[PDB]
Swiss-Prot record, chain A:
One of its GO terms (molecular function) is protein-macromolecule adaptor activity. It comes from Homo sapiens. Component of multiple Cul1-RING E3 ubiquitin-protein ligase complexes commonly known as SCF (SKP1-CUL1-F-box) complexes, consisting of CUL1, SKP1, RBX1 and a variable F-box domain-containing protein as substrate-specific subunit. Component of the SCF(FBXW11) complex containing FBXW11. Component of the SCF(SKP2) complex containing SKP2, in which it interacts directly with SKP1, SKP2 and RBX1. Component of the SCF(FBXW2) complex containing FBXW2. Component of the SCF(FBXO32) complex containing FBXO32. Component of the probable SCF(FBXO7) complex containing FBXO7. The chain holds residues 290 to 776 of 776 of the full protein. GO terms for biological process: animal organ morphogenesis; cell population proliferation; G1/S transition of mitotic cell cycle; intrinsic apoptotic signaling pathway; positive regulation of canonical NF-kappaB signal transduction; proteasome-mediated ubiquitin-dependent protein catabolic process; protein K48-linked ubiquitination; protein monoubiquitination. The lineage of its organism: Eukaryota, Metazoa, Chordata, Craniata, Vertebrata. This is Cullin-1.
Swiss-Prot record, chain B:
HEAT repeats lie at residues 1-33, 35-72, 74-109, 114-148, 154-189, 190-226, 227-261, 314-351, 356-399, 403-442, 447-484, 495-534, 538-575, 578-615. The modification N6-acetyllysine is found at K46. Signal peptide: none annotated. Interacts with TBP. Part of a complex that contains CUL1 and RBX1. Interacts with unneddylated cullins: interacts with CUL1, CUL2, CUL3, CUL4A, CUL4B and CUL5. Does not bind neddylated CUL1. Interaction with cullins is abolished in presence of COMMD1, which antagonizes with CAND1 for interacting with cullins. Interacts with ERCC6. Interacts with DCUN1D1, DCUN1D2, DCUN1D3, DCUN1D4 and DCUN1D5; these interactions are bridged by cullins and strongly inhibits the neddylation of cullins. Its main location: cytoplasm. Key assembly factor of SCF (SKP1-CUL1-F-box protein) E3 ubiquitin ligase complexes that promotes the exchange of the substrate-recognition F-box subunit in SCF complexes, thereby playing a key role in the cellular repertoire of SCF complexes. Acts as a F-box protein exchange factor. The exchange activity of CAND1 is coupled with cycles of neddylation conjugation: in the deneddylated state, cullin-binding CAND1 binds CUL1-RBX1, increasing dissociation of the SCF complex and promoting exchange of the F-box protein. Probably plays a similar role in other cullin-RING E3 ubiquitin ligase complexes. GO terms for cellular component: cullin-RING ubiquitin ligase complex; cytoplasm; cytosol; extracellular exosome; extracellular region; ficolin-1-rich granule lumen; Golgi apparatus; membrane. The lineage of its organism: Eukaryota, Metazoa, Chordata, Craniata, Vertebrata. Disulfide bonds: none annotated. The modification Phosphoserine is found at S490. One of its GO terms (biological process) is SCF complex assembly. Keywords: Acetylation, Cytoplasm, Nucleus, Phosphoprotein, Repeat, Ubl conjugation pathway. The gene is CAND1. It is found in: Cytoplasm; Nucleus. This is Cullin-associated NEDD8-dissociated protein 1.
UniProtKB/Swiss-Prot annotation, chain C:
Disulfide bonds: none annotated. The chain holds residues 19 to 106 of 108 of the full protein. This is E3 ubiquitin-protein ligase RBX1. Changing C57A: Strong reduction in ligase activity. It comes from Homo sapiens (Human). E3 ubiquitin ligase component of multiple cullin-RING-based E3 ubiquitin-protein ligase (CRLs) complexes which mediate the ubiquitination and subsequent proteasomal degradation of target proteins, including proteins involved in cell cycle progression, signal transduction, transcription and transcription-coupled nucleotide excision repair. CRLs complexes and ARIH1 collaborate in tandem to mediate ubiquitination of target proteins, ARIH1 mediating addition of the first ubiquitin on CRLs targets. It catalyses: S-ubiquitinyl-[E2 ubiquitin-conjugating enzyme]-L-cysteine + [acceptor protein]-L-lysine = [E2 ubiquitin-conjugating enzyme]-L-cysteine + N(6)-ubiquitinyl-[acceptor protein]-L-lysine; S-[NEDD8-protein]-yl-[E2 NEDD8-conjugating enzyme]-L-cysteine + [cullin]-L-lysine = [E2 NEDD8-conjugating enzyme]-L-cysteine + N(6)-[NEDD8-protein]-yl-[cullin]-L-lysine. Zn(2+) 2 binds at C35, C38, C50, H64.
Length: 448, 632, 88
């Protein structure tokens, strides 16, 4: 009776005080009134709803405040998100003492304001938060840090599109394993263990396969060095998603280096062709013509472009374009990015060691769009395969039951759209994989 | 059913992938909603060795909830078989076994499995050629100690003495896993175990020390620091005598201090460690590290300021606030952390042999010139920190900075007029300006109106809504301050009339503007009218219809009523008779819905209107008001 | 006139079976080229969504071909083990 009278006629002022206190930084009073109202029997729905909408409003305001910059600067956006998440966690610990209902309310609130927000709204794509998270993780691990990794792993659980982050992280790991620029092995092992505990074996299978491949590559390199500067990192075709490289011109200065490796591979492992990738291979240049010895971290492409200037009276874009046989846009962007550093002798530098390796800044958007599209047809093919193979045991079933089973099976992965599933079913029928029975409508019978 | 399970086993056992998938889906659905158990356990064990990934995933996911209904006789058998396969050669089988063990322990709340696994791992954790086995075993033990940790009547000493030699492993990763396992163990922890652990640590301290021992001590203290009170008196002297070393090893030593204060509050050893950290803040000689050693000292200062409350004169009378204030010209992290420490101290200064007011007042000029020197930086973070510092210094007590407004105004003007400024920076600058204008007397803001009106007016119109609302608040506060009716003033504000009115009426229109900005504009208009409207005579008898048409809207009904109430209760006469005829029925029509705040507001508005203005009153409005009284 | 020397290369290799890159066993055609039955009837996005699959044994085959081979056996033609799927 006391709680009823104190609350039933005081809902408006209590809710206003809740909103005002939550807007400001005052957690002790929030916990005080949470203790005050916790004695109510089944009357907390309004308070839960009010906190949920306020958390949504705070997320929207924080995300929209840093507009036009969080799109290209994921670092500060992820830092702000982590700060907000840890502030809410501390508030919950201090006030709500880890109430299960309130914890669930916070969880779905974070899910809501992470899946969609002001930044997501203008981009017309609700798949950007995993991209920012993966970029932040890669930059953090690209050369004390266990707490931030644990918090990131915890907050990732709210993201429904987990396969997006899994594929992104796998691609970033595959790219990063080429160049010796990873962090300490302890941090990598801890992250692998955390992903193994959280994510299923499907994601970690590729990671373990790549670890085994790099291990055997290192063993083979060590054995060759024992039998015998140069290095080689052999990778499998089905374990490293890499787009096929275009035509390229082999430099004549180190042709024997590739000839000997090819001969050794043919002698040892015959009947297996190799396709070296001339895109990800760095090194240092020993300059002597300059005023002082200088070193540049050069990738294969612009290193070959620079080498194309040795012993040539005249240089033209067309001749190197038709000799190297590379796309014009990539060539132009590389030339612009190398000319921006005032490199293309006589110019000095502040430090003896520079590192000209810089982000592409132009192909990132194209690569991201390509990866998103690839994930799209991956989802389409996966759902098509699931639909066609479900009917192997189930002879005949209704359309609604099949749709429900498909939704339930991949519920932890993603929520496919109804029109996409309908189109997949229709094209499967058109591909002679189904028969339309005339006895019942919206019914199909399995066919070989 | 017996026939159903027999058919499922027969159809599934046909060397098929899709059929196995559907059978696994079926049995998981059945589980969710004597010989059969043996058969399914055997077939799951067979599937555990299958090369397929999806089938193995399905089996390992099924293994979790299967423990609920399976018998308790073969659980030891399957655990032993999994442990035996854990020592295999193929890494994929190793990963599968680890996933299975983690899954079953996760779904576990029969209890012999924990004893068996810990007994086997006691021998497994011992020295072995492979290091991967040790890492996996340490991860498993950490999982046990995080989840299990119940009775363990005669198992803690064995695991303890077996894990002790593992602390000296050359690999840093193995050392970290052992430290994490020990921390989990002490957190889960018994009456004497920590005694032998601390005795061994102290004995090992008097040897060739390494970061491992200090890191382990810090970890066990952080996990459980409420049971170390009699050992400290030999812990601090060791840290002090080991701090005077040339090589860079003081990091963990300084990290120990803040967690020590956080865990154990009552201890009479504060002055020595405080002096140690005060001296250690002075080191000033990525290859360079000296820009990071002060982070631990700053965290130490944060912790000691937060935990201590009853010895404010001891902190204040010393050179500690002085040394904190002068130590500002450092890196971004150091500057941010000292600013955080000072903000925490000022927040603590509020009450919960001179009083702290005297020393605060004497240090105010020092803080002022330090902040003014710190203003000359292009970094946004420093500007936000300085504005938060000013806001805290003004909020703590009223009339604090009454002698530095002329020198602090240009900084605010520059931070508001610069093109390179974030939204948060402008918001906090406007909030600081508003709070300064509110707390301080109007007498120290008259000469600065010529400098404060243009930037505020310019900032009123911005695409953002938070910035616009804060600018409207600042405008209303400035309007109230410039013309205080409480005490007579001698100043001419005629040029600012139109300048404020243009922006105030511009923001009063809909213009698809958010509710908060519209309400702030309505409040600004109400205050401006109430305290200044005699100058506005041309637009007075035609702009009042905006309030009348906005009264119908539910989104803006309280703010307009409050503005009307403020306008009516103004000592200076405001012409409202032509609007009174068409306004009273509008307010009367709202006396039907259940809204206490709106009811009180509109009652106050009508009361003040009839009190101040009663020359012209018809009978229809009086009858309407009277008829609306019984529902109220 | 201007010359310089490179110290290290650190190249990357991608190994694959000669038979797989030569042609796919199921349909006697170039693996790069699209299969025949898909191009025989082009009326939807099948001609574009068709691609080459992958497995544990590092063997590349068309999705339609391997799908058709399924339910006749569960083996890849030239390597004699259970077919596995890892990436598209
Ligand atoms: Zn095809
Ligand atoms: Zn084919
Ligand atoms: Zn094969």
């Amino acid at each position: 009776k006391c709680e009823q009278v104190l609350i039933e006629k005081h809902l408006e002022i209590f809710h206003t005080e809740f909103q005002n206190l939550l807007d400001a930084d005052k957690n002790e009073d929030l916990g005080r009134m949470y203790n005050l109202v916790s004695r109510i029997q089944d009357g907390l729905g309004e308070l839960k709803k009010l906190l949920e909408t306020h958390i949504h409003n705070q997320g929207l305001a924080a995300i929209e405040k840093c507009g036009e910059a969080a799109l290209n600067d994921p670092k500060m956006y992820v830092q702000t998100v982590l700060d907000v998440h840890k502030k809410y966690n501390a508030l919950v610990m201090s006030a709500f003492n880890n109430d299960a209902g309130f914890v669930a309310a916070l969880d779905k609130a974070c899910g809501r304001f992470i899946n969609n927000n002001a930044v997501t709204k203008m981009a017309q794509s609700s798949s950007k938060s995993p991209e920012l998270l993966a970029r932040y993780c890669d930059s953090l691990l690209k050369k004390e840090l266990e707490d931030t990794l644990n918090q990131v792993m915890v907050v990732f659980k709210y993201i429904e599109d987990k396969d997006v982050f899994q594929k992104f992280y796998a691609k970033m790991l595959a790219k990063r394993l080429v160049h010796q620029n990873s962090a300490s092995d302890d941090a990598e092992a801890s992250m692998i263990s955390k992903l193994k505990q959280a994510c299923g074996f499907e994601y970690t299978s590729k990671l373990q396969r790549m670890f085994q491949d790099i291990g055997v590559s290192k063993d083979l390199n060590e054995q060759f060095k024992k039998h015998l500067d140069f290095s080689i990192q052999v990778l499998s075709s089905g374990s490293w998603p890499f787009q096929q490289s275009c035509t390229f011109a082999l430099p004549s200065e180190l042709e024997r280096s590739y000839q000997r490796f090819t001969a050794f591979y043919a002698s040892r492992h015959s009947g297996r062709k190799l396709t070296w990738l001339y895109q990800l291979s760095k090194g240092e240049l020993v300059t002597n013509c300059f005023k002082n010895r200088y070193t540049l971290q050069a990738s294969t492409f612009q290193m070959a472009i620079l080498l194309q200037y040795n012993t040539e009276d005249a240089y033209t874009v067309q001749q190197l374009t038709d000799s190297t046989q590379i796309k014009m846009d990539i060539l132009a962007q590389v030339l612009q990015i190398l000319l921006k550093s005032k490199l293309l002798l006589g110019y000095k530098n502040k430090k003896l060691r520079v590192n000209i390796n810089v982000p592409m800044k132009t192909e990132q958007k194209q690569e991201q769009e390509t990866t998103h599209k690839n994930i799209e047809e991956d989802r389409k093919l996966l759902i098509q395969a699931a639909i066609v193979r479900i009917m192997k045991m189930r002879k005949v079933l209704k359309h609604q039951q099949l749709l429900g089973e498909v939704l339930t099976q991949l519920s932890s992965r993603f929520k496919p759209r109804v029109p996409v599933i309908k189109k997949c079913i229709d094209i499967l029928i058109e591909k002679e994989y189904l028969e339309r029975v005339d006895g019942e409508k919206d019914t199909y019978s399995y066919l070989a | 059913a017996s026939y159903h399970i027999s058919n499922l086993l027969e159809k599934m056992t046909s060397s098929d992938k899709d059929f196995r998938f559907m059978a696994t889906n079926d049995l998981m659905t059945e589980l969710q909603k004597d010989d059969s158990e043996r058969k399914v356990v055997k077939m799951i064990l067979k599937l555990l060795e299958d090369k397929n990934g999806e089938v193995q995933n399905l089996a390992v996911k099924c293994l979790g909830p299967l423990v609920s209904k399976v018998k308790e006789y073969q659980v030891e058998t399957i655990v032993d078989t999994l442990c035996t396969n854990m020592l295999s050669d193929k890494e994929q089988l190793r990963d599968i076994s680890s996933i299975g063990l983690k899954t079953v322990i996760g779904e576990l709340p029969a209890a012999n499995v924990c004893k068996k696994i810990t007994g086997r791992l006691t021998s497994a954790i011992a020295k072995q050629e492979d290091v991967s086995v040790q890492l996996e075993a340490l991860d498993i033990m950490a999982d046990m100690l995080s989840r299990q940790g119940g009775l363990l009547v005669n198992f803690h000493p064995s695991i303890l003495t077996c894990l002790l030699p593992q602390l000296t492993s050359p690999r840093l990763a193995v050392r970290k896993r052992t430290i994490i396992a020990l921390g989990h163990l002490v957190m889960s922890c018994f009456v004497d175990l920590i005694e032998h652990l601390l005795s061994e640590l102290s004995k090992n301290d008097s040897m060739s020390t390494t970061r491992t021992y200090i890191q382990c001590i810090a970890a066990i203290s952080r996990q459980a620091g409420h049971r170390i009170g009699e050992y400290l008196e030999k812990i601090i002297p060791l840290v002090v005598k080991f701090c005077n070393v040339d090589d860079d090893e003081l990091r963990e030593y300084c990290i120990q201090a803040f967690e020590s204060f956080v865990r154990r509050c009552p201890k009479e050893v504060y002055p020595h460690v405080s002096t140690i950290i005060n001296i250690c803040l002075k080191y000033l000689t990525d290859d360079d590290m000296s820009w990071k050693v002060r982070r631990a000292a700053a965290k130490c200062l944060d912790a000691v300021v937060s935990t201590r409350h009853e010895m404010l004169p001891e902190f204040y009378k010393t050179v500690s606030p002085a040394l904190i204030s002068r130590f500002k010209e450092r890196e971004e992290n150091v500057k941010a952390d000292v600013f955080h420490a000072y903000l925490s101290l000022l927040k603590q200064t509020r009450p919960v042999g001179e009083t702290p007011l005297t020393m605060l007042q004497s240090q105010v000029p020092n803080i002022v010139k330090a902040l003014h020197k710190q203003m000359k930086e292009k970094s946004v973070k420093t500007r936000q920190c300085c504005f938060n510092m000013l806001t805290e210094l003004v909020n703590v007590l009223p009339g604090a900075l009454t002698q530095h407004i002329p020198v602090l105004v240009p900084g605010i003007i520059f931070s508001l007029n610069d093109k390179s400024s974030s939204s948060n920076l402008k918001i906090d600058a406007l909030s600081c300006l508003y709070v300064i204008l509110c707390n301080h007397s109007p007498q120290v803001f008259h000469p600065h109106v010529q400098a404060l009106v243009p930037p505020v007016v310019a900032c009123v119109g911005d695409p953002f809504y938070k910035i616009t609302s804060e600018a409207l608040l600042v405008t209303q506060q400035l309007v109230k301050v410039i013309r205080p009716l409480d005490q007579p003033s001698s100043f001419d504000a005629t040029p600012y009339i139109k300048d404020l009115f243009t922006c105030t009426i511009k923001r009063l229109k809909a213009a698809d503007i958010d509710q908060e900005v519209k309400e702030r504009a309505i409040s600004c208009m109400g205050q401006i009218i109430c305290n200044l409207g005699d100058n506005l005579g041309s637009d007075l008898p035609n702009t009042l219809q905006i309030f009348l048409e906005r009264l119908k809207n539910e989104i803006t009904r309280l703010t307009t009523v409050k503005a009307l109430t403020l306008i009516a209760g103004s000592p200076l006469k405001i012409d409202l008779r032509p609007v009174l005829g068409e306004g009273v029925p509008i307010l009367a029509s709202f006396l039907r819905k259940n809204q206490r705040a709106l009811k009180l507001g509109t009652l106050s508005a009508l009361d003040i209107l009839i009190k101040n203005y009663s020359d012209s009153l018809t009978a229809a409005m009086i009858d309407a008001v009277l008829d609306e009284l019984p529902p109220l | 006139k201007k010359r310089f020397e490179v110290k290290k290369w650190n190249a990357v290799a991608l190994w694959a079976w000669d038979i797989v890159v030569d042609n796919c066993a199921i349909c006697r055609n170039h693996i790069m080229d699209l299969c025949i039955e898909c191009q025989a009837n082009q009326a939807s996005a099948t001609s574009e969504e068709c691609t080459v699959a992958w497995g544990v044994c590092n063997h590349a085959f068309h999705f339609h071909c391997i799908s058709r081979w399924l339910k006749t056996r569960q083996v890849c033609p030239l390597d004699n083990r259970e077919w596995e799927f890892q990436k598209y």
